[PDB]
């Protein structure tokens, strides 16, 4: 109701730090915090023992994920099925 529609169809109307997407404002610590924390929870989640990880139907268009997986092979409980 309030702001999305104006952005869509209000022509010349833009402002500063009001929206957070997609990975937009990383030069500001406040925003980055969110993505860094989600990735931190993900990375320390795979460190768990007896945990199953799934990578299904992925094009592997990212770089950090592949390198992290390669460096995290120390876990003998990695199983992957990809389409």
């Amino acid at each position: 109701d309030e702001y999305i529609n104006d952005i869509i169809n209000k022509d010349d109307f833009y402002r500063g730090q009001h929206l957070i997407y997609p990975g937009a404002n990383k030069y500001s610590h406040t925003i980055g915090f969110v993505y860094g924390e989600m990735f931190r929870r993900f990375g320390e989640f795979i460190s768990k023992p007896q945990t199953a990880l799934f990578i299904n139907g992925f094009g592997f268009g990212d770089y950090h994920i592949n390198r992290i997986i390669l460096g995290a092979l120390l876990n003998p409980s990695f199983h992957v099925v990809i389409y």
Binding site: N66, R67, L70, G71, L73
Partner: protein
């Protein structure tokens, strides 16, 4: 001691150092607790490498180089 027969020949013919006489006198014992090994390389350190047996249950396939090269290439 690789120089086993040489010590025997020296003592039989005469001569030899104190170590040769000591090994000769302590080797003459006919006990199962003492083992005699002779050869040009059996008593050397090289022959000891192969004497180690692999564990029955421990895996024998080598998959460390594959992991290292995968990490080097993909990561």
């Amino acid at each position: 001691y690789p120089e086993l027969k040489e010590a025997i020949t020296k003592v039989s013919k005469g001569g030899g150092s104190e170590a040769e006489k000591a090994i000769v006198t302590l080797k003459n014992m006919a006990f199962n607790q003492v083992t005699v090994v002779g050869g040009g390389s059996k008593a050397y350190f090289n022959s000891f490498v192969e004497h180690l047996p692999y564990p029955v249950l421990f895996p024998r396939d080598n998959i460390v180089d594959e992991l290292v090269e995968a990490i080097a290439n993909l990561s």
